[PDB]
Design an enzyme around this catalytic site. Structure first.
Site, PDB file in Angstrom:
ATOM      1  CG  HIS A 135       6.122  11.154   2.739  1.00 36.92           C
ATOM      2  ND1 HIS A 135       5.424  10.548   3.816  1.00 36.92           N
ATOM      3  CD2 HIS A 135       5.739  10.510   1.622  1.00 36.92           C
ATOM      4  CE1 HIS A 135       4.662   9.589   3.318  1.00 36.92           C
ATOM      5  NE2 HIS A 135       4.877   9.529   1.992  1.00 36.92           N
ATOM      6  CG  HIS A 141      -1.200   9.654   0.011  1.00 38.36           C
ATOM      7  ND1 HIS A 141      -1.030   8.762   1.038  1.00 38.36           N
ATOM      8  CD2 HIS A 141      -0.012   9.759  -0.619  1.00 38.36           C
ATOM      9  CE1 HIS A 141       0.222   8.351   1.036  1.00 38.36           C
ATOM     10  NE2 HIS A 141       0.877   8.925   0.019  1.00 38.36           N
ATOM     11  CG  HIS A 175       1.092   8.588  -4.276  1.00 38.22           C
ATOM     12  ND1 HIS A 175       0.550   7.404  -3.840  1.00 38.22           N
ATOM     13  CD2 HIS A 175       2.383   8.313  -4.621  1.00 38.22           C
ATOM     14  CE1 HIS A 175       1.442   6.441  -3.976  1.00 38.22           C
ATOM     15  NE2 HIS A 175       2.552   6.965  -4.531  1.00 38.22           N
ATOM     16  CG  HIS A 207       6.904   9.249  -5.909  1.00 42.29           C
ATOM     17  ND1 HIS A 207       7.378   8.951  -4.625  1.00 42.29           N
ATOM     18  CD2 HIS A 207       5.858   8.425  -6.148  1.00 42.29           C
ATOM     19  CE1 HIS A 207       6.680   7.908  -4.154  1.00 42.29           C
ATOM     20  NE2 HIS A 207       5.746   7.604  -5.050  1.00 42.29           N
ATOM     21  CD  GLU A 230       9.320   6.688  -6.172  1.00 46.42           C
ATOM     22  OE1 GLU A 230       9.924   6.983  -5.149  1.00 46.42           O
ATOM     23  OE2 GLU A 230       8.296   5.938  -6.244  1.00 46.42           O
ATOM     24  CG  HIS A 266       3.423   5.617  -7.928  1.00 45.00           C
ATOM     25  ND1 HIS A 266       4.378   5.650  -6.961  1.00 45.00           N
ATOM     26  CD2 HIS A 266       4.040   5.497  -9.140  1.00 45.00           C
ATOM     27  CE1 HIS A 266       5.539   5.420  -7.547  1.00 45.00           C
ATOM     28  NE2 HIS A 266       5.413   5.347  -8.860  1.00 45.00           N
ATOM     29  CB  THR A 269       8.647   3.492  -4.285  1.00 43.17           C
ATOM     30  OG1 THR A 269       7.695   4.563  -4.165  1.00 43.17           O
ATOM     31  CG2 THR A 269       8.322   2.687  -5.519  1.00 43.17           C
ATOM     32  CG  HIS A 270       6.975   5.702   0.700  1.00 41.38           C
ATOM     33  ND1 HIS A 270       6.060   5.264   1.681  1.00 41.38           N
ATOM     34  CD2 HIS A 270       6.288   6.514  -0.128  1.00 41.38           C
ATOM     35  CE1 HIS A 270       4.858   5.769   1.363  1.00 41.38           C
ATOM     36  NE2 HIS A 270       4.991   6.555   0.307  1.00 41.38           N
TER      37      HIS A 270
HETATM   38  O1  LIG Z   1       5.061   4.839  -3.446  1.00 39.58           O
HETATM   39  B1  LIG Z   1       4.475   3.700  -2.660  1.00 39.58           B
HETATM   40  O2  LIG Z   1       5.302   3.655  -1.463  1.00 39.58           O
HETATM   41  O3  LIG Z   1       4.850   2.559  -3.422  1.00 39.58           O
HETATM   42  C1  LIG Z   1       3.988   2.377  -4.524  1.00 39.58           C
HETATM   43  C2  LIG Z   1       2.595   1.998  -4.070  1.00 39.58           C
HETATM   44  C3  LIG Z   1       2.060   2.948  -3.014  1.00 39.58           C
HETATM   45  C4  LIG Z   1       0.690   3.006  -2.752  1.00 39.58           C
HETATM   46  C5  LIG Z   1       0.190   3.888  -1.812  1.00 39.58           C
HETATM   47  C6  LIG Z   1       1.050   4.711  -1.118  1.00 39.58           C
HETATM   48  C7  LIG Z   1       2.417   4.638  -1.351  1.00 39.58           C
HETATM   49  C8  LIG Z   1       2.972   3.769  -2.311  1.00 39.58           C
HETATM   50 ZN   LIG Z   2       4.326   6.098  -4.974  1.00 37.62          ZN
END
Ligand SMILES: [O][B]1([O])O[C][C]C2=[C][C]=[C][C]=C21
Ligand SMILES: [Zn+2]
Length: 256
Positions: free
Chosen positions: A60, A63, A90, A92, A102, A115, A195-196
């Site tokens: 998706h 990283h 990473h 979005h 986001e 992020h 956020t996921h």
């Molecule tokens: O976008 B995410 O789901 O939320 C913010 C924090 C974070 C950190 C590592 C991987 C994913 C996510």
């Molecule tokens: Zn993120």
């Protein structure tokens, strides 16, 4: 879970009921409702480029992971008493330039969002322990505004051709992601979530008020990553941004 019609954000609550929680991210930051907070210290980042480890296609998104065995790469200051240890960054993005961030500011959608994620190494022993704790994660969000090509993205974009399909991973070394941050680290902070999925309400958000640039053609390199495994029908990663979620009486604080 994913970002398609059937497995996407509007459906995440069926498998992850916290989706409809009181501390969900991202949010729309209404600047007339922010509370300037005099106790907020400046954000301090100190990252060692030797902690950069690996870039990974996670189907998706992609990283960039960092070695997190020690405090070589840390975030301090802002609303925090604890040192937080860098572990990943990473992005979005959206299916066109018109959306893709986001977080939004006064309803304005940016083209993508960076992020930079950290975990509380003063209180916890690992990312896996920290990731479900209210004070466990600290994440810097940077809004990316479509415009001039950003040369600071070059090492990251150049690496994508080695991780084109789901599950591919490559070494990604000698990189300090503080180089991606805007010149001003003026920020908003609020308590929220990943956020996921798994959508844990474990994140203290640091949203930069200054955007960074990205070109149309750089956003196209993100969307040319493939969500399928090698040898399957090509399925571009067109988008991975979650809609904004209700504040539910949280306060967004301003450092400025
Ligand atoms: O976008 B995410 O789901 O939320 C913010 C924090 C974070 C950190 C590592 C991987 C994913 C996510
Ligand atoms: Zn993120």
């Amino acid at each position: 879970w994913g970002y398609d019609d059937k497995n996407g954000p509007e459906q995440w609550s069926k498998l992850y009921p916290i989706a409809n929680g009181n501390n969900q991210s991202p949010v729309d930051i209404k600047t007339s409702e922010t509370k300037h907070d005099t106790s907020l210290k400046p954000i301090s980042v100190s990252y060692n480029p030797a902690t950069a480890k690996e870039i990974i296609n996670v189907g998706h998104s992609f990283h960039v992971n960092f070695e997190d065995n020690d405090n070589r790469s840390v975030l301090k200051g802002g609303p925090f008493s604890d040192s937080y240890r860098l572990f990943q960054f990473h992005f979005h993005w959206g299916s066109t330039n018109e959306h893709g961030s986001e977080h939004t500011v006064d309803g304005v959608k940016y083209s993508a969002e960076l992020h930079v994620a950290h975990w509380n190494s003063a209180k916890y022993s690992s990312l896996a322990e920290a990731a479900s704790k209210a004070d466990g994660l600290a994440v810097i969000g940077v809004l990316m505004k479509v415009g001039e090509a950003n040369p600071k993205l070059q090492k990251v974009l150049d690496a994508l051709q080695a991780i084109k399909t789901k599950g591919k991973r490559a070494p990604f070394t000698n990189f300090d992601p503080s180089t991606l941050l805007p010149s001003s680290l003026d920020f908003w902070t609020y308590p929220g979530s990943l956020t996921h999925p798994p959508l844990y309400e474990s994140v203290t958000w640091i949203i930069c008020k200054e955007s960074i640039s990205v070109s149309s053609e750089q956003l196209a390199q993100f969307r040319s990553l493939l969500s399928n495994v090698e040898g399957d029908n090509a399925v571009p990663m067109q988008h991975n941004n979650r809609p904004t979620q209700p504040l539910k009486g949280r306060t967004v604080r301003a450092s400025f």
